[PDB]
Design a protein around this ligand. Structure first.
Ligand code: MNP
Ligand code: CA
Lengths: 557, 206
């Protein structure tokens, strides 16, 4: 999910510009729901996932807000000590405590019902148990007991009119979420929100802790510890789910790392390229980053140094020279199915070979399979989410930096061979694979582009539409599920704010019983594909001026 | 009027709600959601509570057990019972607004029931506050803020210990899954601030 906020000192023809691209995958009907709320202290406009009461993306005419995933570590697992005799009990601070339990019946259409039991300790629900060691694992969340208050902080924050009011609501949001601020005066801000545990000394948060009492959290860290910045010296805030701040530790997921190879550098380079940006230029960063190969930048210098002493007729060197002429932007050919340059396919095959020769060989099976993906894996329907740099590739990037990497190389991943020899071997693997399928003339290689599917199933895998409701888009774009832009104090209008968004396929998902599709069922789907957007209205005048219908209700509680 | 809710839709069908108190405001919101996204909302409601196999059958029994084992519904109902009246109105207003449109749909199904209900063979039921809260918990807390792999990390660590011996197995683990990496590109520049805590990275708890 990415976001770029541009303040006073970097904005051209405005005081502040906020562009948000929440990335949850692509669905039919649309993941988010557009809604304006005018009354009871609220005056807001925007769109929000699953039509939550509080709007995750939008503005109130004075301030604007947006989010990206935080990925801080807010969950730890507690290894509970069970007893073969006295079952349903667990040792905690010197006594045998009884577990909470509840019975559940699953009713099944055209089947028999199934009942099972859920168990919970003081640390949380039990994930799994090991009868052999008489250990049960409880998942313990720092936000447990604050779900509803987080829902409410996201609703109340829509009323804030400044930083101080807004940070009071951010301090109550307990999930690991980045929050972003912009306002009519051009101020900008960021808070890495949520509740983080206050761990005992010696607690390594990447692995389980005994639940017998000595390792229990002490409490939750205060809000003063949450990474935050207001009006940064740089003039902008950029995030693509990268680290908040220097020395902040990430989620304990084995597949998730914050290292020197990070896709947010791609956003940074474009915002540092120009002294100021207009709204049209801030919007246009969505199109560039959508189409950018993420691995070129990382490993092109390595490829160049390894093939520098080769002759011009060596195929390994020709593959590197193709990459050297490319800027990494993928573009579709006229056929609507192949990419104009073969670069992504080359890095894909090279990286798969490099990982199999380095990271994969140092790790025992079956854990080696966690580190072999190149990051390019998809199917015919295309990626289910954002493109990123794979874990394997982040670990390999540290290894190719040598003693310039801050990460001690406890095992040499090159296994005693000079780097260049491993790079050239992988490049020979690459040439063998690709030339066999496409031939020897690199200039006519037509390699397959990634496509984009709006799925009928939701992110759980459950149908939320019939299978024919699936929509197909020819170009895969590494961009938000929805994109929204808020521009404060435009010099080009009399309005104090201007905002736009795009919620595809459309606002409505309604299909009548006769098969008649609502009028607003797919009117945003072509807009989405061409990087277009529609206006968001906030004031009464603007709403009345663009009204297509009206309905009045008279109700008493 | 305190009893009036005015709903204006724009050229893209986006609703704007005009009301004078909380309960009417969120009742308007609920009502237009039920107009626009009722099947999506009903499948999301079943997805977040683990009641999919009742309308879709045996292929979803595992799915529903997994959803139910990951939360504690009484803990959520207790949070809802501690709300003040103003906060409770948000949730109750929204459920009431949805229900008013579901009442009309179940009364005139020949023109108002979303086709997919016919396709999948079942009809909408009425919502309460718990159901609105669970849309946000099942999809944001319960899995966009619930990531851990601590158990699998411990299995990798043990396997590296066997391969490279006890001290060496730990240093390779730190090579593959470092706790922090000082060269990571950060959203906040080091001139503004750094995170003050330092953590054990030796698995000192064993
Ligand atoms: O990026 C993600 O992986 C999912 C995610 C999770 C929470 C918030 C998000 N957002 O755009 O606010 C996105
Ligand atoms: Ca943890």
């Amino acid at each position: 999910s990415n976001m770029w906020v541009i303040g006073k000192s970097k904005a051209q023809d405005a005081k502040a510009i906020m562009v948000n691209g929440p990335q949850f995958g692509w669905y039919a009907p649309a993941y988010t729901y557009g809604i304006g709320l005018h009354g009871a202290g609220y005056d807001v406009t925007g769109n929000t996932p699953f039509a939550y009461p509080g709007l995750v993306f939008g503005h109130n005419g004075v301030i604007s807000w947006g989010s990206t995933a935080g990925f801080g570590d807010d969950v730890d697992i507690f290894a509970e000590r069970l007893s073969a005799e006295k079952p349903g009990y667990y040792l905690h601070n010197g006594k045998w405590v009884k577990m909470l339990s509840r019975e559940e019946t699953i009713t099944v259409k055209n089947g028999q019902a199934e009942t099972f039991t859920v168990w919970r300790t003081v640390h949380g629900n039990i994930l799994q148990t090991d009868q052999t060691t008489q250990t049960a694992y409880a998942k313990s969340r720092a936000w447990d007991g604050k779900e509803v208050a987080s829902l409410l902080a996201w609703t109340h924050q829509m009323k804030a009119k400044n930083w101080q009011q807004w940070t009071q609501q951010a301090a109550k949001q307990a999930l690991t979420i980045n929050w972003y601020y912009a306002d009519v005066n051009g101020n900008i801000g960021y808070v890495h929100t949520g509740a983080y545990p206050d761990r005992q000394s010696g607690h390594d948060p990447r692995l389980p802790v005994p639940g017998t009492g000595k390792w229990d959290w002490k409490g939750l860290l205060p809000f003063e510890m949450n990474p935050k910045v207001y009006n940064p010296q740089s003039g902008y805030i950029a995030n693509w789910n990268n680290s908040p701040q220097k020395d902040y530790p990430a989620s304990d997921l084995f597949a998730f790392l914050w290292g020197g190879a990070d896709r947010v550098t791609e956003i940074d380079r474009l915002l540092e390229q120009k002294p100021r940006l207009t709204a049209d230029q801030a919007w246009d960063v969505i199109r560039q980053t959508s189409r950018q190969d993420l691995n070129l930048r990382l490993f092109l210098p390595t490829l160049q140094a390894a093939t520098s002493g080769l002759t011009q007729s060596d195929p390994r060197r020709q593959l590197v020279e193709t990459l050297t002429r490319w800027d990494g932007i993928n573009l579709l050919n006229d056929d609507g199915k192949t990419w104009q340059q073969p670069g992504s396919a080359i890095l894909n095959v090279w990286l798969t070979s490099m990982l199999k020769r380095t990271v994969v060989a140092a790790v025992p099976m079956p854990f080696d399979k966690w580190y072999s993906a190149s990051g390019y894996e998809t199917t015919q329907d295309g990626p289910t989410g954002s493109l990123n740099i794979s874990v394997g590739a982040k670990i390999l990037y540290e290894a190719v930096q040598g003693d310039k990497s801050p990460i001690p190389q406890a095992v040499d991943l090159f296994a005693g061979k000079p780097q260049q020899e491993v790079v050239l071997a992988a490049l020979e693997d690459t040439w063998e694979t690709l030339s066999k399928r496409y031939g020897n003339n690199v200039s006519n290689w037509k390699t397959p582009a990634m496509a984009l599917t709006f799925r009928a199933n939701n992110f759980f895998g459950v149908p939320q539409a019939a299978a024919e409701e699936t929509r197909h888009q020819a170009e895969y774009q590494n961009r938000g599920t929805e994109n929204d832009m808020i521009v404060f104090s435009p010099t080009t209008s009399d309005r104090p704010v201007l905002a736009w968004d795009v919620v595809a396929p459309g606002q409505s998902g309604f299909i009548a019983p006769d098969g008649t599709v609502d009028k607003h069922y797919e009117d945003q789907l072509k807009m989405y594909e061409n990087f277009g957007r529609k206006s968001l209205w906030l004031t009464k005048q603007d709403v009345e001026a663009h009204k297509e219908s009206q309905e009045v209700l008279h109700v008493q509680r | 009027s305190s009893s009036e809710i005015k709903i204006v839709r724009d050229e893209y069908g986006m609703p704007h709600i005009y009301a004078n108190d909380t309960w009417h405001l969120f009742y308007g919101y609920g009502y237009v959601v039920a107009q626009d996204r009722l099947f999506q909302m009903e499948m999301a409601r079943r997805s977040t509570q683990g009641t999919v196999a009742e309308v879709l059958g045996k292929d979803f029994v595992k799915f529903d057990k997994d959803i139910r084992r990951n939360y504690w519904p009484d803990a959520i109902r207790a949070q809802i019972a501690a709300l003040s009246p103003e906060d409770m109105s948000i949730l109750q207003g929204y459920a009431d607004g949805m229900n008013a449109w579901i009442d009309k749909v179940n009364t005139n199904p020949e023109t108002l029931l979303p086709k997919q209900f016919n396709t999948f063979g079942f009809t909408p039921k009425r919502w309460e506050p718990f159901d609105v809260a669970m849309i946000f918990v099942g999809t944001m807390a319960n899995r966009f803020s619930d990531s851990t792999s601590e158990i699998d990390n411990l299995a990798l660590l043990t396997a590296l210990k066997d391969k490279y011996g006890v001290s060496q197995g730990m240093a390779v683990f730190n090579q593959l899954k470092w706790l922090v990496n000082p060269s990571a590109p950060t959203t906040i520049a080091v001139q503004e601030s750094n995170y003050p805590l330092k953590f054990n990275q030796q698995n000192s708890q064993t």
